[model samples]
Target chain A: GAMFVPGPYHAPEDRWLVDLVRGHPLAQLASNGAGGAAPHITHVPIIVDPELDGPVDRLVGITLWGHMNRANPHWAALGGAANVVATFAGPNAYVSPAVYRTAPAAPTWNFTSVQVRGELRKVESADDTLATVRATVAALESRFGAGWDMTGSLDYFRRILPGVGAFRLRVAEADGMFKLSQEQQPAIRRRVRHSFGGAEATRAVAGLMDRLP
Target chain B: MFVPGPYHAPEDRWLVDLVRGHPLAQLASNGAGGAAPHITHVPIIVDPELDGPVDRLVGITLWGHMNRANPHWAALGGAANVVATFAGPNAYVSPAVYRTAPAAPTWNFTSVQVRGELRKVESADDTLATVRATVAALESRFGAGWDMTGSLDYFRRILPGVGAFRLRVAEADGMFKLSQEQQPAIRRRVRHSFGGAEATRAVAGLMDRLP
Candidate 1:
């Protein structure tokens, strides 16, 4: 975990984090006991539950759904007491110290990353696993040019069902870094935001900075 | 580990090229005896290595930085299970990308990962090089030019606040799962399907280039 360094615009709100995770949902889910002593990282796509209706939903908990291929050995190695970190990475860009008015400033990265920690509860039923996968596919299908609702036959689904596994990352806490150069002067922020890299990174950073309260 | 998946070049040029293209890397750590696996996202500089893969993967040198206040720096020495991922251009490959029936949705990406032990760099000289190389790579991307003019006094003043680390890379690995083994007809279908889609154009171009 990166140390908690706070500033005026460092707002770690649930709304922003939830949106960030959903937008860039392909995460590296890691666990300690899985895949030998080294941290087991399974790159998988996750779907965040959209029905967080109230503060209780935020406080009591939230659910994240994901599945991995059965061929991945980490599927069997996931039962340890250790929690998992699902890393949701957002855009990142370099902010040269030369741009800042503060002479002592060192170059820093303006980025957004959220690490969700929780024990994963494996979905035991094959039906439940399919449901998780179906929901994931539904979310991603539209971006592939059109809707695709599992046109494969029943026999095909049955064959691949065993080849897939499901798990719910039972949420405990979500911590993150919204390092957007909030500590710098506003003029510096505007200069970088308006005149910085013309890519998604700079645009996203500028957008995030504007969304800050 | 992604099951020693095929379609990846054990060749150093392709791997190095992909890493260079995707500079933003995520370094993972499980702490000392594998407890807290913290993931740090930072831009990495991969020094050019002309040699091909041998007993070791490649002769590439890599460097990155972290704020000194970040606790993850302590876990870099004697590092293992600490995998760093250089995520490349990726896109979702629709079943429509294939001419064959009963196809499933799968992602296609070109990425490289390295598991190495790193010790905090002590020499000011190497640390300076790391910063210079990193900044140069970054500035070149946008075609926006800039250079470091901070004097030694100013450099040392802010240097201590930042932790510079050097990893004598122990092992290097790569994976490029870009739908190679599919039927040749399916490959052609994918090339066309990906070509029009702006997001998948890179994948489509790579697929077209394949034999």
Candidate 2:
């Protein structure tokens, strides 16, 4: 369980969790060392398909697709590593103590975070990696509709495919931490929601707060 | 001049600049042994004069303030000497390479950061350090009207102050690395998608894309 300052974790509803992913879905994968020994922490785009069932459905996965120069040892070491941590940070907002309804309180921050600890499985075949890369492009394009298409131009796709690599992480454990402004009185909570209006990050929290009992 | 990636001499713009000084600021201070064996880093928050002349500022310039509770050296020797690096990452975003109409493209990140080197100036005069720290904290809120007499009533009205030692930085640097590499079209696309996230906006504003 992840802890929030000034309060405890609240179990976020499934829809609320989905909204969190939709808004800020990138995960930072941090690794230590450099070159071959160097660990990498990357902000990767994720796609979670709830319809897929079984162990794979529980996977709660994302693809880390990017290119590392052949000269960089990390490109080689990534193929062999079996374990890595994928940290997905949800909505977060900075709370100024002055904004609190009650007096005599110090400032603190609130946010939601999920950490997925898992084993890394690299998709080493260049063609497979290229396909994943294309799929990612398709997913992004679908969000925009007819404005774009991945298969429309093969030459353009081939031109950008040289630098693509993809790896999938099979999550072993999913730890979620949601620290909203739950400790305040209902009136104060309303005040917070009002004060935080229009903030993308705080709006997400406000949505979560409204759904909670 | 500033170096992109890494391995460049620390720049002054990136090391001493700040966006806003109100509330509290994150500070890093450091200390060392006579033999110069190793340098330790400590992070803490300190109140600073938000309106002081940019240059006349003084305090150990090199090992000034740190959190007393940091546990970097609990193992062997008493508390190990420390140095802290203060970072204020405002808003940052990445530019999609596809946005560029025709050019060698890259992603951009912008932020304002400062680094101060400090040492304990007066271990015995704890009260003096506390008062100075309070004044520093007040400067952000009071700005041009930050005279001590005008703030005396509020200072007395609030709770009694806490104490900490002081130091000044020996060297400081700053960096304003907004993407100056991307052309206007790509820059505009980034701003349209990431609006008001100051880092990305700054990068887009400062980028210089060649045809």
Candidate 3:
């Protein structure tokens, strides 16, 4: 919901950024109360397709799946809701300000996050649900490359098809917040960035800093 | 809740190990069926004190304040059903045996979360319900040594006494879903192609290897 113009994205040769998006176990979704009387919040693991639309501005294609307890109040408005908010948190780490070479700077954190506001469409048919599963598997393979395939497990996919529900978020707005140490002095920022660069969460503050305007 | 023995955790450190317990935001408790629930999540900065009790493993403390207007202040059932769940997430990655290399390994993700069920209790009679809940949360973080009694005037001097609430964790559960069923070769391959920089990969590796 918060907006800021960020720096230009520098494509580091490694596939770390793509990996971060693929590895998230869960994402937070908040629904605006426009279609219904009350707003709702839910957490779900999403499959994100980075290759769709040919990598233009880090577009996130999300597989929407969640269940409300029969007693939950929002069930009545489910099929009609038009707008939904979703957040995908990729690899993140805390960067102590003390890590900076200078004294005046206070502690801050560096991480990458993607926020999406979109229209929600419910998947109603058995055919649609199967398509959703196949899409999810394709997204997974895009990140893993050619060696990973779903052809061997047709039976496994069939067994689990009944219990799951699938939906799609036609993303209308997408924002990427790369809160790396761009505001800090170059000397200190470089040290902090390098520390995370070699370690995992390697996308680090520098790349985020470069993306900032 | 799905329980897998290898994924279960008995200690708080296990939860803190991957995810940072002190997040920047607070959760506001929304009332059940109310337009907006009376309970809300509020974000506060927290610091942990580890040496006190071995059993108090996740011994970190929080340091932020909320307002009386905040919905959580008005709720009833201070101890009975009123509960707060603090979540910490670790990584879980699914590895593919087909992608392996001795030089590099890929991993899948799983997460670790800690839930502390608390009760609202006020230390002073005059303390407003809101102030009491805030103070209690702070005291738990400050531990016994910080002298609140010596500064009674200072403590009560503010317009709203810091709210005091009890942090009593009644029950806790942990779920770690890594590719435990996958063969080692496939698991190792997953770590190679997909591991990247996320903690999810590291934890996924741990889960696959856990006995």
lDDT of each: 0.67, 0.41, 0.45
lDDT at residue A75 of model 1 (Cα atoms): 81
Q: How would you encode candidate 1's per-residue C-alpha lDDT over A67-143 as one tens digit per residue?
A: 88777877877754456788877766667665665554456678887778777887879998777777777777774
Q: What are the runs in model 1 whose C-alpha is more than 4 Å off?
A: A1-9, A33-37, A50-60, A80-82, A96-107, A143-145, A151-155, A196-202, B32-36, B47-59, B75-81, B96-100, B141-143, B150-153
Name the best candidate (by lDDT).
1
Comparing 1 with 2 on TM-score, the higher-scoring candidate is: 1
Q: Please provide, for model 3 over B149-198, each residue's C-alpha lDDT reduced to its tens digit, 9 standing for 90 to 100.
A: 34345445553534444443333334454455457776565446435546
Please identify model 2 stretches exceeding 4 Å from their true place: A1-7, A14-19, A34-40, A49-79, A142-146, A152-154, A198-202, B1-12, B15-185, B188-211
In Å, candidate 2's interface RMSD is 10.6
- 1 against 3, candidate with superior DockQ: 1
Listed for every candidate in order, the interface RMSD values in angstroms are 3.5, 10.6, 10.1
lDDT of 2 by residue, B60-179 (tens): 232233223332122113322222323233223322334432222222333322323233333435534455455444443422223454444444443233224343433333333344
Question: In each prediction, how many residue pairs overlap at the backbone (N, C-alpha, C within less than 3 A)?
Answer: 1, 45, 59
Model 1 docking tier (incorrect/acceptable/medium/high):
acceptable
**DockQ: which candidate is best?**
1
Query: How close to the true structure is residue A70 of candidate 2, measured as C-alpha lDDT?
Result: 34
Which number leads on TM-score? 1
